[PDB]
Every structure is written in structure tokens, then in C-alpha cells.
Design an enzyme around this catalytic site. Sequence first.
Site, mmCIF file in Angstrom:
data_model
loop_
_atom_site.group_PDB
_atom_site.id
_atom_site.type_symbol
_atom_site.label_atom_id
_atom_site.label_comp_id
_atom_site.label_asym_id
_atom_site.label_seq_id
_atom_site.Cartn_x
_atom_site.Cartn_y
_atom_site.Cartn_z
ATOM 1 N N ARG A 186 0.729 -1.368 -0.072
ATOM 2 C CA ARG A 186 0.057 0.066 -0.057
ATOM 3 C C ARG A 186 0.993 1.185 -0.028
ATOM 4 N NH1 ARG A 186 0.690 2.095 4.941
ATOM 5 N NH2 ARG A 186 1.150 0.119 6.240
ATOM 6 N N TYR B 71 -3.796 -4.827 -5.174
ATOM 7 C CA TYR B 71 -3.046 -5.496 -3.950
ATOM 8 C C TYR B 71 -3.810 -5.006 -2.613
ATOM 9 C CZ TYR B 71 0.332 -7.285 -1.177
ATOM 10 O OH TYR B 71 1.230 -8.116 -0.044
ATOM 11 N N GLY B 72 -3.822 -6.180 -1.781
ATOM 12 C CA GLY B 72 -4.101 -6.044 -0.279
ATOM 13 C C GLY B 72 -4.987 -4.975 -0.044
ATOM 14 N N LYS C 130 -8.361 -1.906 5.635
ATOM 15 C CA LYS C 130 -7.762 -0.854 5.998
ATOM 16 C C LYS C 130 -8.690 0.350 5.561
ATOM 17 C CE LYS C 130 -3.877 -2.639 7.735
ATOM 18 N NZ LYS C 130 -3.582 -2.662 9.076
ATOM 19 N N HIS D 282 -6.082 0.024 14.853
ATOM 20 C CA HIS D 282 -5.079 -1.117 14.404
ATOM 21 C C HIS D 282 -4.488 -1.910 15.653
ATOM 22 C CE1 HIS D 282 -1.119 -1.584 11.709
ATOM 23 N NE2 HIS D 282 -1.834 -2.618 11.596
ATOM 24 N N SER E 106 3.265 -2.003 11.595
ATOM 25 C CA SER E 106 4.102 -3.242 10.607
ATOM 26 C C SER E 106 5.184 -3.632 11.004
ATOM 27 C CB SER E 106 4.313 -2.573 9.377
ATOM 28 O OG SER E 106 5.176 -3.218 8.639
ATOM 29 N N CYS F 195 6.069 -5.612 13.623
ATOM 30 C CA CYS F 195 6.292 -5.750 14.745
ATOM 31 C C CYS F 195 5.433 -6.734 15.649
ATOM 32 C CB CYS F 195 5.808 -4.290 15.488
ATOM 33 S SG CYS F 195 7.151 -2.894 14.700
ATOM 34 N N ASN G 79 1.715 -12.271 15.748
ATOM 35 C CA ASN G 79 2.544 -13.451 16.706
ATOM 36 C C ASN G 79 1.681 -13.248 17.820
ATOM 37 O OD1 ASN G 79 5.324 -14.652 15.178
ATOM 38 N ND2 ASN G 79 4.719 -12.294 14.853
ATOM 39 N N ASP H 41 -5.520 -7.969 13.820
ATOM 40 C CA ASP H 41 -5.343 -6.528 13.145
ATOM 41 C C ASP H 41 -6.220 -5.351 13.357
ATOM 42 O OD1 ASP H 41 -3.522 -5.501 11.034
ATOM 43 O OD2 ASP H 41 -4.958 -5.052 9.739
ATOM 44 N N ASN I 33 6.527 -8.493 2.131
ATOM 45 C CA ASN I 33 5.238 -8.241 2.822
ATOM 46 C C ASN I 33 4.339 -9.148 2.122
ATOM 47 O OD1 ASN I 33 3.018 -6.041 3.969
ATOM 48 N ND2 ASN I 33 5.066 -6.463 5.186
ATOM 49 N N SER I 34 4.640 -10.368 1.446
ATOM 50 C CA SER I 34 3.988 -11.289 1.078
ATOM 51 C C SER I 34 2.925 -11.824 2.056
ATOM 52 C CB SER I 34 4.533 -12.302 0.423
ATOM 53 O OG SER I 34 5.582 -13.207 1.218
ATOM 54 N N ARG I 35 1.632 -12.015 1.796
ATOM 55 C CA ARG I 35 0.781 -12.356 2.544
ATOM 56 C C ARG I 35 0.053 -13.679 2.508
ATOM 57 N NH1 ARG I 35 -0.323 -8.263 6.958
ATOM 58 N NH2 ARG I 35 0.959 -6.516 5.882
ATOM 59 N N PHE J 84 8.301 -13.787 21.408
ATOM 60 C CA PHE J 84 7.296 -14.970 21.021
ATOM 61 C C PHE J 84 6.758 -15.408 22.057
ATOM 62 C CE2 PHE J 84 8.785 -14.175 16.621
ATOM 63 C CZ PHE J 84 10.237 -13.796 16.621
ATOM 64 N N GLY J 85 6.643 -16.905 22.193
ATOM 65 C CA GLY J 85 6.135 -17.694 23.278
ATOM 66 C C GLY J 85 6.398 -17.074 24.716
ATOM 67 N N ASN K 248 6.459 -14.204 25.367
ATOM 68 C CA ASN K 248 5.880 -12.909 26.025
ATOM 69 C C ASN K 248 4.802 -12.991 26.705
ATOM 70 O OD1 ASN K 248 7.646 -10.995 24.380
ATOM 71 N ND2 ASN K 248 6.659 -11.404 22.696
HETATM 72 N N1 LIG Z 1 12.754 -10.691 18.247
HETATM 73 C C1 LIG Z 1 11.206 -10.991 17.979
HETATM 74 N N2 LIG Z 1 10.525 -10.696 16.778
HETATM 75 C C2 LIG Z 1 9.264 -10.808 16.986
HETATM 76 C C3 LIG Z 1 8.482 -11.089 18.092
HETATM 77 N N3 LIG Z 1 7.160 -11.103 17.618
HETATM 78 C C4 LIG Z 1 7.035 -10.909 16.510
HETATM 79 N N4 LIG Z 1 8.428 -10.587 15.734
HETATM 80 C C5 LIG Z 1 8.851 -10.576 14.636
HETATM 81 O O1 LIG Z 1 7.887 -9.279 13.898
HETATM 82 C C6 LIG Z 1 8.081 -9.563 12.418
HETATM 83 C C7 LIG Z 1 6.659 -10.174 12.045
HETATM 84 O O2 LIG Z 1 5.714 -9.390 12.371
HETATM 85 P P1 LIG Z 1 4.217 -8.989 11.638
HETATM 86 O O3 LIG Z 1 3.367 -10.033 11.537
HETATM 87 O O4 LIG Z 1 4.389 -8.064 10.309
HETATM 88 O O5 LIG Z 1 3.392 -7.808 12.534
HETATM 89 P P2 LIG Z 1 1.799 -7.392 12.384
HETATM 90 O O6 LIG Z 1 1.779 -6.586 13.264
HETATM 91 O O7 LIG Z 1 0.983 -8.523 12.226
HETATM 92 C C8 LIG Z 1 1.972 -6.784 10.656
HETATM 93 P P3 LIG Z 1 0.644 -6.606 9.906
HETATM 94 O O8 LIG Z 1 -0.474 -5.533 10.808
HETATM 95 O O9 LIG Z 1 0.807 -5.784 8.430
HETATM 96 O O10 LIG Z 1 -0.191 -7.690 9.522
HETATM 97 C C9 LIG Z 1 8.831 -10.766 12.178
HETATM 98 O O11 LIG Z 1 10.204 -10.246 12.100
HETATM 99 C C10 LIG Z 1 8.824 -11.571 13.506
HETATM 100 O O12 LIG Z 1 10.141 -12.083 13.925
HETATM 101 C C11 LIG Z 1 9.053 -11.318 19.334
HETATM 102 O O13 LIG Z 1 8.371 -11.556 20.295
HETATM 103 N N5 LIG Z 1 10.523 -11.152 19.116
HETATM 104 MN MN LIG Z 2 -0.467 -9.183 11.050
HETATM 105 MN MN LIG Z 3 -2.147 -4.237 9.889
#
Ligand SMILES: Nc1nc2c(ncn2[C@@H]2O[C@H](COP(=O)(O)OP(=O)(O)CP(=O)(O)O)[C@@H](O)[C@H]2O)c(=O)[nH]1
Ligand SMILES: [Mn+2]
Ligand SMILES: [Mn+2]
Length: 603
Positions: free
Chosen positions: A78, A226-227, A235, A255, A277, A279, A283, A302, A394-396, A513-514, A516
Site C-alpha cells: 500500500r 493489492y491487499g 484498511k 489497528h 508493521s 512488529c 504473533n 489486526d 510483505n507477501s501475505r 514470541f511464546g 511474551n
Molecule cells: N525478536 C522478536 N521478533 C518478533 C516477535 N514477535 C514478532 N516478531 C517479528 O515481527 C515480524 C513479524 O511481524 P508482523 O507479523 O509483520 O506484525 P503485524 O503486526 O501482524 C504486521 P501487519 O498489521 O501488517 O499484519 C517478524 O520479524 C517476527 O520475527 C518477538 O517477540 N521477538
Molecule cells: Mn498481521
Molecule cells: Mn495491519
Amino acid sequence: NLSAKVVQGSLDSLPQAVREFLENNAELCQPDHIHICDGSEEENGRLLGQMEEEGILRRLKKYDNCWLALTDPRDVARIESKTVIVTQEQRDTVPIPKTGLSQLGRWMSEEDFEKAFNARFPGCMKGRTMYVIPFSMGPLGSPLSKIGIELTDSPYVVASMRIMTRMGTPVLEALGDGEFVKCLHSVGCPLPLQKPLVNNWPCNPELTLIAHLPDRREIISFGSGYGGNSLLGKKCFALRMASRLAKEEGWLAEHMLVLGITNPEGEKKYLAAAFPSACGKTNLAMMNPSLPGWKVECVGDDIAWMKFDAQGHLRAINPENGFFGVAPGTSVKTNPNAIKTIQKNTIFTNVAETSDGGVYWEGIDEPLASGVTITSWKNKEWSSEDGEPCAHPNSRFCTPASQCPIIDAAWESPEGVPIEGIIFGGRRPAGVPLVYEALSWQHGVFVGAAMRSEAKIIMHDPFAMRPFFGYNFGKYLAHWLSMAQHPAAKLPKIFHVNWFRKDKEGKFLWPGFGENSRVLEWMFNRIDGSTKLTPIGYIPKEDALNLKGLGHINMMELFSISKEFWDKEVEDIEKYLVDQVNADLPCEIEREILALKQRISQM
Ligand SMILES: Nc1nc2c(ncn2[C@@H]2O[C@H](COP(=O)(O)OP(=O)(O)CP(=O)(O)O)[C@@H](O)[C@H]2O)c(=O)[nH]1
Ligand SMILES: [Mn+2]
Ligand SMILES: [Mn+2]
């Protein structure tokens, strides 16, 4: 006359205002046919089959009904520059900044947009079929749901909307003669094609424009398939147009992910989080927590719409129907629930394909079997020895929310879930501790207003809404401030995390990750009412964060708050808010700025 062009459904069955919308636009765009989507499996099947025949999609035979779109590299994310909100007064859309051009949205005059539309849409769907997509943002019926009609010339949009929204006959039924958001979209390449077509993926990068007219409740998009420029609820509607309705009507469009978290004693809290994005919203929204006995369930990854209920709780519904997930970096380790989700009925876009018909991407961490090779998203045999990622970064994937093995039992409940915590945060390599808590609502608002993230550039992304404000950010900060005056409000506690703090060699101080879930446990219990006061907010006191089960953590670096660094940060926060929000910055915020520089000067 027009009926003659209808290849599915009946003009006479549309509510009048749906029909007018369609007639007018059919006449302007001149599609060869009109297909009124009904949202059924058979139609999905038929659309995918056509798409396969046309080269638009290929089958990923390694899975149950998964498909792959490859786009023109020119149409792959976008574009802010080309995304605008149109209102009679600029101020209603973004603040007039002190210096520079505004970084909080992009305004276009009604006059200018009228000329841009007339230079793009007349005749634009020639030789194409115009699809009519009735869809609902939120559970069909819910008091928090809205409806849109999206007119489009892309079958990819249709099939993707079937997943990202509730779509089809049943929405027309619920709409009856109700109001709806008009949504018009065109890939912008009438036949005969006047230009080359890459991967069978039509786009018109040069005329690409994505427009929002909140006062007319129209979203108008041209030129990209796209998207977020084409799935008009994802969005344009869900954040831009909604944040304005929400401002008008007393609710919030954000968001944010929303999850439901359970402790070993059965007590469950719902939390919302805004990160930009890259961040990690996705996850965290469906994380598998490492703490024994805790449970995390996903409400949405999202977007969140939130509205105080009668007893003052902030209720969130997820107005989406699916996850439109960044693929690269997804793996069994980083996001096992996402991996199970997309095992089926999922459309992927711009990822790589293995020789046995599987998908592939950077960070999938999944060794290929002997003799399995990879075709990159540009359709070339690929290896690590080139200097390009096999998937676009930024493939989906685009997958049903109902297939997430931990989708929350209330994800579609029409009254929404009570948010007890709001989380902000971004990528910050230095200076910002793993987690802190806001000192008050007002401070929490400033905390969101102050978010920055490294995207080697660190940028401001207030509330993770920077590309998504549907109106003047200074009025958006007042609107959020205003909630502390809602009768009997149960204000969610506010927190800011940072999973990305680095040591001097650039390695992550925190495994994330986990893990958190440990940070969550601390917020869950602060919600239940411990802390150490710092000038930026509360952090966990010594030994409060549960570290059993981990390897070494340099806790002292991780929670380190330096005067020098924070002298710098507040100066930068100050200059950013005053210049960019200028006459619209609410005084509560100016007070929160001055107060943090007061608290820091004492250190
Ligand atoms: N080091 C680390 N990286 C993290 C952690 N959680 C997610 N990431 C990283 O953040 C990125 C994936 O994030 P993304 O799925 O883009 O976040 P989103 O907030 O869902 C993005 P969008 O709204 O556009 O869909 C990857 O680099 C993944 O490693 C974490 O706890 N630690
Ligand atoms: Mn996401
Ligand atoms: Mn988003």
C-alpha cells in the site's frame, strides 16, 4: 437493458439503494458483465477455477484447497503517498503542521479528487466483469457491525473478501434498506489491454489512487489489485472510514489485535494491542504461551472496534473474518497457531512455491526434502546464492479466522469482549525497557501518541495508526482523552512493551514470541492489582517478572532507563507532537509532555 449484462443474481433482488449504486457505477465503468456475488462455496469454486484458467492463481497441491497469486512487482504494497482522504476542509483530515508537510495523513480537495476520478474511472471496466460484493464488517447483525457494498473488477478481490469479511446473499438480507459504505475499486486496465500484463496481474501504478470520502461514506480506489488497496474493508473501511464514524458516534476504530488470556486458575482477561508493521501483532494475537497453565486465545489479529457498554466496559469486536498475515517469518517456532491455520482454504500472495506444490518463505525454517526445489515469487528457480528473498517481504496469506486452532469462543459474539488492557509498542533497539505501565489514562494516551519504531530509520507511528488516521490526529487524541469522562468508565490499564531491545552486538535481549506470555502475566496481575515507579511509568519490581524456565536474561540492561537517552527521547517526542499536531494538540497532551520532562530532569 442492464439486466442483460447480469450473469449472476437479480437486479430486482437488491435493495434500491444497492441497485442505484450498482447502476450508476456500471454506467460509468462500462463492464461487459455484472456478477452479483452470493458468497456460496460453488461460486468460490467457480471463481477459483476461472482464476486458475486465466493464470491469475495457481493451485498449491501440497494442501487442501490453497492457492497462490503472484503479482506484478510494481503493485506489491500500500502506498501512502497515493492514499488520501478527501474533505472540504483540510484541518478536518490532518493538522496543519508548523514546518514541513504533515506525516499524519494526506488530504486532497474535493475539486482535485473530482478531476482525478473523471480522469480514471469512465470506461475502466471495459471487457471486464463487475463483481458486486455485499459484505459485513463484524458478525452479521451485531450492533457494532457495518456493511459495505464493494464493486470491483477483480476476482482476486472477491475470493479474498470471502475470507476477510462475511460476504454474500445473507449480508444483502441483513442490510435490507439500511445504510452501507459505498466501495468502488478497479484494477484500472480496461481491455484491450493498453499495456503489458505481468503475471496476468492487472494494475496501473501510474494512476494508482486510493481515496476516502467520509462525508459521502464512499471509498474509491483505482489502479492496484493489492491487499489494502483493493480489499476495501481491510484498511480503507476498517480503519480509515471507521475511525471517523467512530469519532462521530462515540467508539474506537484501531489497528489492534485482541486476545483473551487465561491464567492457571481459570480467570480470563481480554487485551488489545497496537503495534505497527513488522512488529508482531499477529504473533501475539495467537501466541502459544510458554508459561505452564496459561492459555491464550485469538479474537482478532489486526483490527479492533471498541465501544463502551452500558456498565462502562470497553467492548471489542473484530470486524474482520480472517487473518491477512505477513508470511515471511512465520514458522512452527514463531507462530505455530498461524501455521496450523493456513493448512487449508487459504490464498497466498507473493510467496515462493516448492516443487511439490508447497509454499516457502524467508524464516519458514522448514528444511526442504531431497530434490524439492523452490520457485521464487517472481517465477524463477531460486537459491540462497542470489541476493533476493524467495518471497516478497510483505507477501501475505489470507486465511479463515475460524480455522485458528485457538480462535476464542467469543470471537463473533455480537456484544464484543471487555478489554481490560491496551498495549502499545514498537521496535526499539535501544533505551526502552521490555515493558512499562502508564501512570494514568492521560499519560497512556500520550504513551500511544509518542510511539516510534525502527522501520536504519526510527520513525513516529502514533498508536500504530500513522497511515490510517481517518481524520485529524489532534482530534483523534482529544477523542481518546474524552473517554476518561465517560460516565462510570472502566478504563483499560495501558502498557507499552518493546520486544526488540538489543545489546551492543545487536542481539535481542529478550527471546520473545511464546516467552511474551511472561510479560502478559505481569500485566494480567497488575490489572488485578507489583510496581516500581520510574519517570516513564511503572516497571516490574525486582523478581516480579517470571523467568523460570528461561536461560539467562540481562534483566538490568533490559529494564535500563537512562537520563541521557530519555532526555533525548522526550525532546524528540515534544518536537514531533508540537510541529505535527500544532494547533490541534490537546492540552492534556502538552501537560503530559511537560510532566515527563519534569520527571526525567529529576533523575
Ligand atoms: N525478536 C522478536 N521478533 C518478533 C516477535 N514477535 C514478532 N516478531 C517479528 O515481527 C515480524 C513479524 O511481524 P508482523 O507479523 O509483520 O506484525 P503485524 O503486526 O501482524 C504486521 P501487519 O498489521 O501488517 O499484519 C517478524 O520479524 C517476527 O520475527 C518477538 O517477540 N521477538
Ligand atoms: Mn498481521
Ligand atoms: Mn495491519
